[PDB]
PDB file of C-alpha atoms in Angstrom:
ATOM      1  CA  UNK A   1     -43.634 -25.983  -0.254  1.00  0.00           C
ATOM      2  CA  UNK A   2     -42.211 -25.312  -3.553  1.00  0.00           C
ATOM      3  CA  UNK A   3     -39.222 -26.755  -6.056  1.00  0.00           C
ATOM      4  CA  UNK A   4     -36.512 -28.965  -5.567  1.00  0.00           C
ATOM      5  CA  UNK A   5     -33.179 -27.652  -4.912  1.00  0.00           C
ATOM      6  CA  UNK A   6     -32.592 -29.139  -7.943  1.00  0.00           C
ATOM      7  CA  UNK A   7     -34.555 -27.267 -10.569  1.00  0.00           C
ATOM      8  CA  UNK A   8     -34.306 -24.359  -8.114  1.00  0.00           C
ATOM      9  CA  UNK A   9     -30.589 -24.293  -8.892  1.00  0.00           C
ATOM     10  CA  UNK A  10     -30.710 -25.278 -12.098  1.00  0.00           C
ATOM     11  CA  UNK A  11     -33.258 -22.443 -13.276  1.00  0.00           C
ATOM     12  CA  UNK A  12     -31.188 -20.071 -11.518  1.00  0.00           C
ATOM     13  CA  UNK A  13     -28.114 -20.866 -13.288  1.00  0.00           C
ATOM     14  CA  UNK A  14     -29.943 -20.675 -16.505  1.00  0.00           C
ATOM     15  CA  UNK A  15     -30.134 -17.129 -16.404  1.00  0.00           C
ATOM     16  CA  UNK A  16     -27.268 -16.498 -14.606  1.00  0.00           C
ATOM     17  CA  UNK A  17     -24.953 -18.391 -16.606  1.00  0.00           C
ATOM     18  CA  UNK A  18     -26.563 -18.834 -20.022  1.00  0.00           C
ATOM     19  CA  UNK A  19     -24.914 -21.445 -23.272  1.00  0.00           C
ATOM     20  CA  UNK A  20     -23.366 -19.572 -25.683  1.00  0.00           C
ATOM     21  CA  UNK A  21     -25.762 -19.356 -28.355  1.00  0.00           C
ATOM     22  CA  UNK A  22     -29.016 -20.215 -25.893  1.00  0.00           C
ATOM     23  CA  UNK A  23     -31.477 -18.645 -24.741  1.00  0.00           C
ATOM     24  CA  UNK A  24     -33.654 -19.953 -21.983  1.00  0.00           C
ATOM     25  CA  UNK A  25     -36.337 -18.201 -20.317  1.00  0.00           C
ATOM     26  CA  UNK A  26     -38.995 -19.675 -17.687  1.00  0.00           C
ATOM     27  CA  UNK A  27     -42.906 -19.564 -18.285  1.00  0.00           C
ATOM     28  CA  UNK A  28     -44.829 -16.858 -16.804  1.00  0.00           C
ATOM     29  CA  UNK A  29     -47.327 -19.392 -15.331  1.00  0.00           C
ATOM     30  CA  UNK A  30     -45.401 -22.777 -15.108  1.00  0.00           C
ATOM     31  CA  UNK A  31     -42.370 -22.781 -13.260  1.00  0.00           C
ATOM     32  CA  UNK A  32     -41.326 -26.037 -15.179  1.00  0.00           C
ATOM     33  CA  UNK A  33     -41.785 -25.214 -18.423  1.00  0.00           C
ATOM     34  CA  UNK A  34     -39.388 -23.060 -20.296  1.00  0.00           C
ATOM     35  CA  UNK A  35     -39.160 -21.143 -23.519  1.00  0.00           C
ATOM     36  CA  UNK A  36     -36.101 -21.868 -25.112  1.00  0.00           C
ATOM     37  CA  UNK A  37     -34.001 -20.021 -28.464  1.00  0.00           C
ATOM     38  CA  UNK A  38     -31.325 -21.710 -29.811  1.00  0.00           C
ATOM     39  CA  UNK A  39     -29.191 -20.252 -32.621  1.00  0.00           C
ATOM     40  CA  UNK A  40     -27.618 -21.711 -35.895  1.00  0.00           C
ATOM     41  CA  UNK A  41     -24.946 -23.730 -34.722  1.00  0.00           C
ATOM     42  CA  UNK A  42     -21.554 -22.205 -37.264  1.00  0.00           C
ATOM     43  CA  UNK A  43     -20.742 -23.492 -40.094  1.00  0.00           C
ATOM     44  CA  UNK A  44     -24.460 -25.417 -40.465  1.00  0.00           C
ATOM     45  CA  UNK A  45     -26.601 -24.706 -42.936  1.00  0.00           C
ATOM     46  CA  UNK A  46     -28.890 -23.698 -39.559  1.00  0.00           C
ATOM     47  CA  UNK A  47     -26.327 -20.451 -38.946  1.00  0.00           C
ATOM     48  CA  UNK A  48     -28.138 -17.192 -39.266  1.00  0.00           C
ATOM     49  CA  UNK A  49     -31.254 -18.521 -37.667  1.00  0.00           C
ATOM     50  CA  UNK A  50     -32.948 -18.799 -34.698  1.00  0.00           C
ATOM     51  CA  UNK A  51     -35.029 -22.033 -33.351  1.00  0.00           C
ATOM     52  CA  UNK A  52     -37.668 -21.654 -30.984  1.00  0.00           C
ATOM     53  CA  UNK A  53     -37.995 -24.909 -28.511  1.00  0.00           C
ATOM     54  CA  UNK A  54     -40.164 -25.833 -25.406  1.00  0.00           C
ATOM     55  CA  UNK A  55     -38.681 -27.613 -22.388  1.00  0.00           C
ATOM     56  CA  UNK A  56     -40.653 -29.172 -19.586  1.00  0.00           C
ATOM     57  CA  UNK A  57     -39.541 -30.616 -16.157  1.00  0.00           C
ATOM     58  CA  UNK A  58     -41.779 -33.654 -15.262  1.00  0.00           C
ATOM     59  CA  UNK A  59     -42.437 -33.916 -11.862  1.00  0.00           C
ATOM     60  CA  UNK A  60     -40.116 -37.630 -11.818  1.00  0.00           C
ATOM     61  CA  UNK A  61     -37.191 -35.238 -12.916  1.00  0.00           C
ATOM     62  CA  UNK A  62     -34.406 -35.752 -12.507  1.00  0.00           C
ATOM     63  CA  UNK A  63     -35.064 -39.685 -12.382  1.00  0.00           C
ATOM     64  CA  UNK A  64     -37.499 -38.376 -15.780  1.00  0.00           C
ATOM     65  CA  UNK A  65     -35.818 -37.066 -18.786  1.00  0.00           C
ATOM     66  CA  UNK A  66     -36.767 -33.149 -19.764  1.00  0.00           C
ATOM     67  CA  UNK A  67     -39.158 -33.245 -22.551  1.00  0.00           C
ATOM     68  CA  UNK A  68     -38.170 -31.259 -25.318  1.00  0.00           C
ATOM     69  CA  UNK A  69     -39.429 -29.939 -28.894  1.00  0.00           C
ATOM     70  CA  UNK A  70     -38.766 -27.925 -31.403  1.00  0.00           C
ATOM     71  CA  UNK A  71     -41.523 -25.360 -32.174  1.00  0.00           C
ATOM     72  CA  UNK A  72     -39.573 -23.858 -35.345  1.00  0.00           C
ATOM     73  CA  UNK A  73     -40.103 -25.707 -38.619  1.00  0.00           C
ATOM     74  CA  UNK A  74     -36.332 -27.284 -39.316  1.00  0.00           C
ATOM     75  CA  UNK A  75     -34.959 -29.468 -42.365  1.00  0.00           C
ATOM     76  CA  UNK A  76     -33.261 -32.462 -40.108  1.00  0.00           C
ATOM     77  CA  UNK A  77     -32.877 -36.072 -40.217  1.00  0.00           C
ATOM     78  CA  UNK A  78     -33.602 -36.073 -36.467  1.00  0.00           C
ATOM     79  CA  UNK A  79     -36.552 -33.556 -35.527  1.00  0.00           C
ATOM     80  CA  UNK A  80     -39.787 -34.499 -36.967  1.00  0.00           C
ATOM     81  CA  UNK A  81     -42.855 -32.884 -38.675  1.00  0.00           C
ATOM     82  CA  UNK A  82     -44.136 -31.920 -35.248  1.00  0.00           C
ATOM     83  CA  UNK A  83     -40.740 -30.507 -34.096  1.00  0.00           C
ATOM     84  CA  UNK A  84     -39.607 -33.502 -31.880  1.00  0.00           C
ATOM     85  CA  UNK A  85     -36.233 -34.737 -31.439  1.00  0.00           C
ATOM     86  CA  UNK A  86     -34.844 -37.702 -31.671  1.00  0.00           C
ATOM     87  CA  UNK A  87     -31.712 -38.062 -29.359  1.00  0.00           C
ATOM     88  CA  UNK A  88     -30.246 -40.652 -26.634  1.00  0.00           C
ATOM     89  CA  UNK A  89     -30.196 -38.921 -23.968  1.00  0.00           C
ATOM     90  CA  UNK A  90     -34.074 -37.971 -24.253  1.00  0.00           C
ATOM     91  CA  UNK A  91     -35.186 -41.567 -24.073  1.00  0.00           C
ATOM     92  CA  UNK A  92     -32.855 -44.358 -23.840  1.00  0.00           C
ATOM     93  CA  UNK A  93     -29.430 -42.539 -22.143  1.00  0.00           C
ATOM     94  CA  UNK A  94     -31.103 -40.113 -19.731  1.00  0.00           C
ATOM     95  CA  UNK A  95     -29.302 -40.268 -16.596  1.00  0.00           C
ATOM     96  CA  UNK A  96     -30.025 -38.356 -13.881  1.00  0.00           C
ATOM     97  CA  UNK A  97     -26.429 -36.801 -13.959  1.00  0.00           C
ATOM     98  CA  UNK A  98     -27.159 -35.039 -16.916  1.00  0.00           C
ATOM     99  CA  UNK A  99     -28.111 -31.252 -16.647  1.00  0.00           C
ATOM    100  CA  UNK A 100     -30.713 -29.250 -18.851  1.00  0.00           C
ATOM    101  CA  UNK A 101     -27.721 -27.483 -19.824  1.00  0.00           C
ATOM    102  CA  UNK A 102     -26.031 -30.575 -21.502  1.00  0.00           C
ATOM    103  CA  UNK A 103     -29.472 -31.832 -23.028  1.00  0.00           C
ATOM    104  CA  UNK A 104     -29.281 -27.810 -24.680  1.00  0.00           C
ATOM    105  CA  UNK A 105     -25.572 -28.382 -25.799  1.00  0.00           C
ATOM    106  CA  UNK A 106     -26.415 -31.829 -27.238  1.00  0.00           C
ATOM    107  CA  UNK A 107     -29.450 -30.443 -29.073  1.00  0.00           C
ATOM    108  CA  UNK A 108     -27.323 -28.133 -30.447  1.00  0.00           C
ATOM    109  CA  UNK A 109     -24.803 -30.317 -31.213  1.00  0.00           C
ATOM    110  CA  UNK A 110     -26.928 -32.261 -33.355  1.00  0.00           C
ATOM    111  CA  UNK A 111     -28.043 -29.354 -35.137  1.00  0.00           C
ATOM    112  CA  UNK A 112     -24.028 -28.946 -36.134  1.00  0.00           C
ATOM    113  CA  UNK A 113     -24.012 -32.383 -37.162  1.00  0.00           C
ATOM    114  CA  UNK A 114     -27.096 -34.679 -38.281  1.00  0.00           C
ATOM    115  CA  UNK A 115     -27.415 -38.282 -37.731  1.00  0.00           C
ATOM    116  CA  UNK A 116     -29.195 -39.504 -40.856  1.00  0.00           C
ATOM    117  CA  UNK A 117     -28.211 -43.007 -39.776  1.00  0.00           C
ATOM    118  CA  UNK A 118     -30.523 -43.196 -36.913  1.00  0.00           C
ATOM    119  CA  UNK A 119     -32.628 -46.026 -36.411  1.00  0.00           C
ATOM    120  CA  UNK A 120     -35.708 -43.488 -35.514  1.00  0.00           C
ATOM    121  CA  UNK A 121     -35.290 -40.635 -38.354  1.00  0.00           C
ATOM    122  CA  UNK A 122     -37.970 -39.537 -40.545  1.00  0.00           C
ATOM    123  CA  UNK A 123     -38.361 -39.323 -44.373  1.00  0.00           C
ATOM    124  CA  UNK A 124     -35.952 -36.633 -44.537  1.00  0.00           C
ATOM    125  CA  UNK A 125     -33.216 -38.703 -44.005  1.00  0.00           C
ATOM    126  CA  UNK A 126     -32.996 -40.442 -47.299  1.00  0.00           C
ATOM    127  CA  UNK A 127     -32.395 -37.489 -48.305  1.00  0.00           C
ATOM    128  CA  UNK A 128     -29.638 -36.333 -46.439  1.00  0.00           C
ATOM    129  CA  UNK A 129     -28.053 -39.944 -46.655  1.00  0.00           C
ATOM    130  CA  UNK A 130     -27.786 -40.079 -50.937  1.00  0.00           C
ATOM    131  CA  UNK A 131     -27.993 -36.228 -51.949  1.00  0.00           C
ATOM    132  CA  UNK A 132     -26.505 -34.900 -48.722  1.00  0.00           C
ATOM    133  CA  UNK A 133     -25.470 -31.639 -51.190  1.00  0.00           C
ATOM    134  CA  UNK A 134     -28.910 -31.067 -52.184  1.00  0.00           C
ATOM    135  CA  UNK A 135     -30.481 -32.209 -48.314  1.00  0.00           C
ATOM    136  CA  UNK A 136     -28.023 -29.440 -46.835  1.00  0.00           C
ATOM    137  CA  UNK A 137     -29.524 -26.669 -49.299  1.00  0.00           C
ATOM    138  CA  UNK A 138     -32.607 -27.154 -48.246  1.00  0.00           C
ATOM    139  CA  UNK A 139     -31.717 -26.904 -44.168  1.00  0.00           C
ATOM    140  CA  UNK A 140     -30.642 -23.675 -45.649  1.00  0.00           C
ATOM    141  CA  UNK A 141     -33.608 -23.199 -47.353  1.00  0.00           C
ATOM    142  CA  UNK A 142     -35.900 -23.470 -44.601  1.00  0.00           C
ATOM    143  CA  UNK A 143     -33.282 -21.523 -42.377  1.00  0.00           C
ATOM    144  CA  UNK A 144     -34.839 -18.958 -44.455  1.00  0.00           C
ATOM    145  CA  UNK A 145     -38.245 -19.528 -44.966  1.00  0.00           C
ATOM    146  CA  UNK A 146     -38.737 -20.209 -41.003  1.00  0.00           C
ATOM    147  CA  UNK A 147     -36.526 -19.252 -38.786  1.00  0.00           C
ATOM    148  CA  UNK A 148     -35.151 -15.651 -39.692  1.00  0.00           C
ATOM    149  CA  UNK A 149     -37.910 -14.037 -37.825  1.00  0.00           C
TER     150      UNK A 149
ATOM    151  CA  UNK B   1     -49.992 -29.718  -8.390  1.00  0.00           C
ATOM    152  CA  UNK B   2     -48.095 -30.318 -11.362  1.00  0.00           C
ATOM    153  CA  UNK B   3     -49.136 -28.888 -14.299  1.00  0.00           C
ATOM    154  CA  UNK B   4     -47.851 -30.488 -17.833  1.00  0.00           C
ATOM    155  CA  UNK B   5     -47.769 -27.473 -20.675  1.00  0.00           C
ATOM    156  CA  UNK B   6     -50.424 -27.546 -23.115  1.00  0.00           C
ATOM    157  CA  UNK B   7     -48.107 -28.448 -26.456  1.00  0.00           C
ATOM    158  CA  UNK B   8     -47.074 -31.325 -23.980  1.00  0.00           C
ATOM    159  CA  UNK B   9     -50.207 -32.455 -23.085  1.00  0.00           C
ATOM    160  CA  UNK B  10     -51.191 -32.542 -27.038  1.00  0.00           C
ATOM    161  CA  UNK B  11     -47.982 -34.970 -27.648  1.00  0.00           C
ATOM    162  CA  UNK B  12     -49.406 -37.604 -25.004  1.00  0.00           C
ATOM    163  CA  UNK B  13     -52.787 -37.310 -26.838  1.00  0.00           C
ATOM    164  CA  UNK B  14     -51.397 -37.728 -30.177  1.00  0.00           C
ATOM    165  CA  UNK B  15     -49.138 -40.917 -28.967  1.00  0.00           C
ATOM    166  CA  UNK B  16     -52.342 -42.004 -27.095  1.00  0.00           C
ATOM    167  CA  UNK B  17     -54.185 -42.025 -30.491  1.00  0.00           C
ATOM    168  CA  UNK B  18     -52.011 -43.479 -32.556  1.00  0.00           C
ATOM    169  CA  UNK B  19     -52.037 -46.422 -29.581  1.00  0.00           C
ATOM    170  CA  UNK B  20     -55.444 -46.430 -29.322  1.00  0.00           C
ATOM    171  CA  UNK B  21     -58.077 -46.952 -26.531  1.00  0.00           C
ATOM    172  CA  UNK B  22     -60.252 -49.951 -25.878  1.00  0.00           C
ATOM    173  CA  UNK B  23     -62.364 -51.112 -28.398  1.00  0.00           C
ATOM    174  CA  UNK B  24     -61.771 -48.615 -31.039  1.00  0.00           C
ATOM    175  CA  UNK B  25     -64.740 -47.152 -31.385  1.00  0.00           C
ATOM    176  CA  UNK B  26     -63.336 -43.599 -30.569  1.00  0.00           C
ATOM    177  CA  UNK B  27     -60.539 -42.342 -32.517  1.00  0.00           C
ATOM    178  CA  UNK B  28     -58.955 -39.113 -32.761  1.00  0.00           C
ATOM    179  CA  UNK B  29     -55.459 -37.606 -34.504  1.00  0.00           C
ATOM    180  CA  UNK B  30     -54.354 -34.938 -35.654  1.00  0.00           C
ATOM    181  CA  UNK B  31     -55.670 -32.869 -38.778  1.00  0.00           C
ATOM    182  CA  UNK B  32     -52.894 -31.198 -40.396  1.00  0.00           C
ATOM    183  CA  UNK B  33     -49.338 -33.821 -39.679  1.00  0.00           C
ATOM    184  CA  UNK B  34     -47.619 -30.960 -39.909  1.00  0.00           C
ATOM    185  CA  UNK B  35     -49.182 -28.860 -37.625  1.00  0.00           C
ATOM    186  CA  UNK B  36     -46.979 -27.762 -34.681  1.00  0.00           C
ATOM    187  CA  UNK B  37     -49.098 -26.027 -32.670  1.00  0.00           C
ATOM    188  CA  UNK B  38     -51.266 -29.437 -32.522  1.00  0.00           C
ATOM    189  CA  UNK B  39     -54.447 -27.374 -32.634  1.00  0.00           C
ATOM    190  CA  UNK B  40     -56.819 -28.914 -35.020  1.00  0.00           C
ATOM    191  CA  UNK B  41     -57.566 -32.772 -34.475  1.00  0.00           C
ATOM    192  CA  UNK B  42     -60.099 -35.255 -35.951  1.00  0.00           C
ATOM    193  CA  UNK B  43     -62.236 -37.001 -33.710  1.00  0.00           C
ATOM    194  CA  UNK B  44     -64.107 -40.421 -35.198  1.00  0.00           C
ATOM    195  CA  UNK B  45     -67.049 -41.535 -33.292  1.00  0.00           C
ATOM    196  CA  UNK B  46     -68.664 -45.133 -34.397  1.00  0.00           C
ATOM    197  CA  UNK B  47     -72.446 -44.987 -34.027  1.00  0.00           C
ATOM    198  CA  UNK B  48     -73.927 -47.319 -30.790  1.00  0.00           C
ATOM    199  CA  UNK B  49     -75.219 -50.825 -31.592  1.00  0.00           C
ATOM    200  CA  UNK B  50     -79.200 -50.640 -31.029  1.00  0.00           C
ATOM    201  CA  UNK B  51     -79.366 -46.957 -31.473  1.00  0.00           C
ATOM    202  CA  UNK B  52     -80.712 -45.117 -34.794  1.00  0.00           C
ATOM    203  CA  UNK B  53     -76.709 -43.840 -35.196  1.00  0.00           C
ATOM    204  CA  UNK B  54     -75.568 -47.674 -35.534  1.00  0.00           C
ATOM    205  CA  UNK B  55     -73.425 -49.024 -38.115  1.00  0.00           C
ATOM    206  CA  UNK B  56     -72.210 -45.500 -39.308  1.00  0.00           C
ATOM    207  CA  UNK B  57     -68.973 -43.567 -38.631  1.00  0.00           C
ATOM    208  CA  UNK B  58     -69.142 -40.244 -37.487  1.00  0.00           C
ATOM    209  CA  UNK B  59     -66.029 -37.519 -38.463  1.00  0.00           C
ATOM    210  CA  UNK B  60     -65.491 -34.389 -35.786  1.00  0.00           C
ATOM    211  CA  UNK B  61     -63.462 -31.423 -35.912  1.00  0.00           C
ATOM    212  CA  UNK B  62     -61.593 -30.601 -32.549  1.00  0.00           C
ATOM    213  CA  UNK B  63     -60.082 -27.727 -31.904  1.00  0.00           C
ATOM    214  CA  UNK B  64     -57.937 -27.046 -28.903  1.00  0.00           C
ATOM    215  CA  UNK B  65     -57.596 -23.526 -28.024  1.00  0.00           C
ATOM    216  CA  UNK B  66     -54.731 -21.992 -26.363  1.00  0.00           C
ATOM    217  CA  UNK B  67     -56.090 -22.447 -22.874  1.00  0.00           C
ATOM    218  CA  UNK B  68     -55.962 -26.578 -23.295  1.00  0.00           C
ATOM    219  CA  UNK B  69     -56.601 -28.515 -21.840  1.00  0.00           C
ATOM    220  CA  UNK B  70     -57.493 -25.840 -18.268  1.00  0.00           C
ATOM    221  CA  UNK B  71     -60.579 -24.997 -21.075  1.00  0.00           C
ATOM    222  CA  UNK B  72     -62.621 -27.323 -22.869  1.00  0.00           C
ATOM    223  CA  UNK B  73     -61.896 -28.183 -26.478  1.00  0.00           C
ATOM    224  CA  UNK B  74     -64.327 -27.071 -29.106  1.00  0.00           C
ATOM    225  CA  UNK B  75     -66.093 -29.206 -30.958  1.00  0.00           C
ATOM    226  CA  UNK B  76     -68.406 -30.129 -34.260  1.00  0.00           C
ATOM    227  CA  UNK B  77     -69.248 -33.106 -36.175  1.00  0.00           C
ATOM    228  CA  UNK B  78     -68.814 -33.003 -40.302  1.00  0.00           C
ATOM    229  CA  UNK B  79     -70.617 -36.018 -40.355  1.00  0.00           C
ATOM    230  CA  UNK B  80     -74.762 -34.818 -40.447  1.00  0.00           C
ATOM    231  CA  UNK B  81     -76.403 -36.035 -37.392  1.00  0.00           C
ATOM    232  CA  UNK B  82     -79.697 -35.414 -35.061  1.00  0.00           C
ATOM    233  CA  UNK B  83     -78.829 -35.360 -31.764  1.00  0.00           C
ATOM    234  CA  UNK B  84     -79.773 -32.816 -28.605  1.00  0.00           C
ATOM    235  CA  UNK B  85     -77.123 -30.832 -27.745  1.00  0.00           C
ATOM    236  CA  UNK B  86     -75.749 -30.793 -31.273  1.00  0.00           C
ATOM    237  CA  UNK B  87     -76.665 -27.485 -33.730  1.00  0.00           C
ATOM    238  CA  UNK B  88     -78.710 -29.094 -36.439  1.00  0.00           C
ATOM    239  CA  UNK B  89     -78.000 -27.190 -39.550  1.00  0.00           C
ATOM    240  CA  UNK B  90     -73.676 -26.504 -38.926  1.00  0.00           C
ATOM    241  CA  UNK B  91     -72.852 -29.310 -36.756  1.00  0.00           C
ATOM    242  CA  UNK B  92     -71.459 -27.500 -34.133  1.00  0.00           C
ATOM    243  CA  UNK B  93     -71.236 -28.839 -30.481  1.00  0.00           C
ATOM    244  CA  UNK B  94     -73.355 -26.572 -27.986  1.00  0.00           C
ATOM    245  CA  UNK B  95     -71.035 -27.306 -24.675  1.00  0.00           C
ATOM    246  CA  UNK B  96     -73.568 -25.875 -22.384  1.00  0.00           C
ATOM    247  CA  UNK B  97     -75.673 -29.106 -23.227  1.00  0.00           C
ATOM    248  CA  UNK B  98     -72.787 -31.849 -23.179  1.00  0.00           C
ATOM    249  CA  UNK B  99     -72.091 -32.276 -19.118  1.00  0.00           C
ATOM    250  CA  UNK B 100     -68.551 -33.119 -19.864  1.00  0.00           C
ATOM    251  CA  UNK B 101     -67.620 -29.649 -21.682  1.00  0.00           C
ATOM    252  CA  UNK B 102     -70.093 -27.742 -19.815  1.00  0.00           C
ATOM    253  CA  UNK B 103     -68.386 -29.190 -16.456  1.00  0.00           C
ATOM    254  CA  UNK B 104     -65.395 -29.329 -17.782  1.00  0.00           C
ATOM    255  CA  UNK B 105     -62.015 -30.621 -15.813  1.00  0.00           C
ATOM    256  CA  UNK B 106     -58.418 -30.236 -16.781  1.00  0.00           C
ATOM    257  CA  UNK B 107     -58.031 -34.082 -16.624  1.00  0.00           C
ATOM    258  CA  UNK B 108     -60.179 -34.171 -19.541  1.00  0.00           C
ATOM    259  CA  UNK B 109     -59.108 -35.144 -23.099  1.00  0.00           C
ATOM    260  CA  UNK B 110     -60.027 -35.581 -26.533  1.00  0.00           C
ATOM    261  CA  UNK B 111     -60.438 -39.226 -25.959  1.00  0.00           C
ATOM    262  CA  UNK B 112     -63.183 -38.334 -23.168  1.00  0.00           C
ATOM    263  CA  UNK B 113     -65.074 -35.815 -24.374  1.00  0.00           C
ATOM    264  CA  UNK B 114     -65.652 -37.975 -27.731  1.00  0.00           C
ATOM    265  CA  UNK B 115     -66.156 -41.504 -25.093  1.00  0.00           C
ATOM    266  CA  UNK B 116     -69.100 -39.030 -23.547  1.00  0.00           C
ATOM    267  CA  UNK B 117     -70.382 -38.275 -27.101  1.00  0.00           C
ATOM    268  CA  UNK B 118     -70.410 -41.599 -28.103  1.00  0.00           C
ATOM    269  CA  UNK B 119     -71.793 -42.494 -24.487  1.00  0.00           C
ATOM    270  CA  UNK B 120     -74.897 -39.734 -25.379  1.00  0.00           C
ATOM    271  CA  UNK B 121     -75.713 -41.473 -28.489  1.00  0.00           C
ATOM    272  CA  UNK B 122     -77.546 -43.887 -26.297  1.00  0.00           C
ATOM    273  CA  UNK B 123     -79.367 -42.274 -24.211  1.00  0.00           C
ATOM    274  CA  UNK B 124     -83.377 -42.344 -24.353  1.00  0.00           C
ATOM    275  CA  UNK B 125     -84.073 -38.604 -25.943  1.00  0.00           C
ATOM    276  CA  UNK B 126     -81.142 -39.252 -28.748  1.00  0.00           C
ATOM    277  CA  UNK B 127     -81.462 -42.939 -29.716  1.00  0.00           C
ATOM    278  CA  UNK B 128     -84.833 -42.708 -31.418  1.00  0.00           C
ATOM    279  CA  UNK B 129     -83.947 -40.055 -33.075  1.00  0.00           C
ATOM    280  CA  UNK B 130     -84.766 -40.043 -37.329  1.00  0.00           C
ATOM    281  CA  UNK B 131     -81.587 -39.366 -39.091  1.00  0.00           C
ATOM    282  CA  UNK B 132     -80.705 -37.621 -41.714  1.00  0.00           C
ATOM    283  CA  UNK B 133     -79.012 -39.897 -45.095  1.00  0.00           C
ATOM    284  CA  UNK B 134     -76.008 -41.327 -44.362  1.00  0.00           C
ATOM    285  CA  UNK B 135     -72.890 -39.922 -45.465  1.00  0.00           C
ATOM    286  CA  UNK B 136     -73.923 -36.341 -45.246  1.00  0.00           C
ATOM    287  CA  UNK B 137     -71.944 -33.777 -44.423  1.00  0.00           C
ATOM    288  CA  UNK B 138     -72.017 -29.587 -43.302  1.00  0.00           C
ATOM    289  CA  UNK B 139     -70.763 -26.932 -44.905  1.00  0.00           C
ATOM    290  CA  UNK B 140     -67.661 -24.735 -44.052  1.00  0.00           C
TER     291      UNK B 140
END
């Protein structure tokens, strides 16, 4: 009468065996909708803070992708004004193979290294393509200003 | 029976308005682009053809509470306008007189309840209405 094995299992693990550096906790109404906290990948100009995201399970998934979104303000070539994320495996290279887990990883992954080259980034990444120096100081800068509370 | 978050229903209603619907004479997007919480929206109703509101554009404030969309937006026009159901001196949006936001469903949207507005504009009590000048707006 309830979830798929599927989510079942993969909820379960979530707080049984949580990423390094993520936290992921379910909603206290929606059983598909999770309140996620990843931390500063190290070494980025991110480290020291801590991003809140949402993440909700359609009802097509796993044939759907996750949706996911960042709900910190964050300097990057490849989250948005409104906190969403530009990344394969959200839209184009979702495959039902792929875990919530590795859509986490991969988040964070991008975090430790920006792809200002991507055909969908936003203003930001003219920035970080000719004054990557100065574009990285300001990561740091909002680090700061937004995500150290 | 499926329920997509709040923040995610906002993101299909902001892709659905930068789309847009039919014949484009509803509108609605979001206030503040850099507004994560997606609250605050601006709704744009065109004025009905053979109605007293005709050939004028009509600017809303929508505000979608943390409850959205399980609870109705709330809603008030900038634009000055005479029309029941609508506070006459601050614009505001009295949803016990709109059907749609005083029967309110959860697969409601921005896009409907300013379709029913628009839709209201035309009825009998509202489309002999006098007017006041065009391009008037409320305060605050």
């Amino acid at each position: 009468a309830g979830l798929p094995r599927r989510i079942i299992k993969e909820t379960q693990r979530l707080l049984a065996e949580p990423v390094p550096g993520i936290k992921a906790e379910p909603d206290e109404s929606n059983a598909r909708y999770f309140h996620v906290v990843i931390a500063g990948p190290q070494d980025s100009p991110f480290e020291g803070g801590t991003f809140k995201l949402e993440l909700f399970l359609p009802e097509e998934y796993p044939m759907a992708a996750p949706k996911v979104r960042f709900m910190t303000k964050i300097y990057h070539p490849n989250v948005d004004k409104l906190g969403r994320i530009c990344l394969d495996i959200l839209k184009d290279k979702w495959s039902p193979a792929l875990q919530i887990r590795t859509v986490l990883l991969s988040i964070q992954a991008l975090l430790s290294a920006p792809n200002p080259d991507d055909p969908g980034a936003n203003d930001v990444a003219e920035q970080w393509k000719t004054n990557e120096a100065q574009a990285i100081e300001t990561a740091r800068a909002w680090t700061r200003l937004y995500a150290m509370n | 029976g499926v329920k997509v978050p709040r923040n995610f229903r906002l993101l299909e209603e902001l892709e659905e308005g930068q789309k847009g619907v039919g014949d484009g004479t509803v509108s609605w997007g979001l206030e503040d682009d850099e507004d994560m919480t997606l609250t605050r929206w601006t709704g744009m109703i065109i004025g009905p053809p053979r109605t007293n509101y005709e050939n004028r554009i009509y600017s809303l404030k929508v505000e979608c509470g943390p409850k959205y969309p399980e609870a109705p937006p709330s809603v008030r026009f900038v634009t000055k306008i005479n029309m029941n159901g609508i506070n006459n001196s601050s614009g505001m949006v009295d949803a016990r007189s709109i059907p749609v936001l005083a029967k309110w469903q959860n697969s409601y949207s921005i896009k409907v309840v300013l379709q029913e507005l628009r839709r209201l504009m035309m009825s009998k009590e509202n489309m002999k209405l006098p007017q006041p000048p065009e391009g008037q707006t409320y305060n605050n």
